[PDB]
Amino acid sequence: SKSEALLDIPMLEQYLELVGPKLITDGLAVFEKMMPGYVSVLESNLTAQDKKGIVEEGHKIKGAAGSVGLRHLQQLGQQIQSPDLPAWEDNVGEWIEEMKEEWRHDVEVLKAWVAKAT
Ligand SMILES: [Zn+2]
């Protein structure tokens, strides 16, 4: 059930048919190199209590993750960039830490899925 929950399987299956696995795996390699810096910027903005900085970085990750089918990371970045939500002030530091702790795992789950599908 982890593949279904963390990845966008319909999008990935259509992508495999249209482009093949190489564009997905190359995109994923770029995502892995940029994510350490994206999460560090989220954290430094959280410390500075810079709301615009946090929302801007959330939006960048949302797009980045959605491009490679990381549906749950995309949903976290959607929540991070949504200060209109009643729970935002209470939970944005929790969603930041959740992202920090899990993104490498979510990348390993997509790598395995692409390996099995191909
Ligand atoms: Zn999570």
Cα of 75 vs centre of ligand 1, distance in Å, is 9
For 47, other C-beta atoms within 10 Å of its C-beta total 9
Max Cα-Cα span within the chain: 45
Beta-carbon-side half-sphere exposure of residue 77 (alpha carbons within 13 Å): 24
Q: How far apart are CA 79 and CA 75, in angstroms?
A: 6
Q: Give the dihedral of Cα atoms 16, 21, 26, 31; nearest 10 deg.
A: 50
For 108, other C-beta atoms within 10 Å of its C-beta total 12
- The conformation of residue 85, written as its DSSP 8-state character, comes to S
User: 3-state class of 81 per DSSP?
Assistant: coil
Of 82, 18, 74, nearest to 54 (Cα)? 82
User: Experimental method for this entry?
Assistant: X-ray
Cα of 78 vs centre of ligand 1, distance in Å, is 12
Cα of 104 vs centre of ligand 1, distance in Å, is 11
The answer to whether the beta carbons of residues 72 and 57 sit under 8 Å apart is: no
In order of 49, 66, 69, 76, 96, the CA distances from 8 in angstroms are 32, 8, 5, 14, 21
Cα of 114 vs centre of ligand 1, distance in Å, is 20
SS3 content of the chain, % helix, strand, coil (to 5): 85, 0, 15
Q: How far apart are CA 1 and CA 116, in angstroms?
A: 15
In the chain, the domains with their CATH numbers are 1-118 (1.20.120.160)
User: Quick one: resolution in A?
Assistant: 1.6
Cα of 109 vs centre of ligand 1, distance in Å, is 13
What is the CA 82 to chain-centroid distance, rounded? 15
Question: Hey, what amino acid is at 3?
Answer: S
In order of 17, 21, 51, 108, 118, the CA distances from 13 in angstroms are 7, 10, 36, 17, 10
Cα of 103 vs centre of ligand 1, distance in Å, is 8
Q: Work out the burial of residue 88: count CB atoms within 10 Å of its CB; fewer than 13 is exposed, 13-18 middle, 19 or more buried.
A: middle
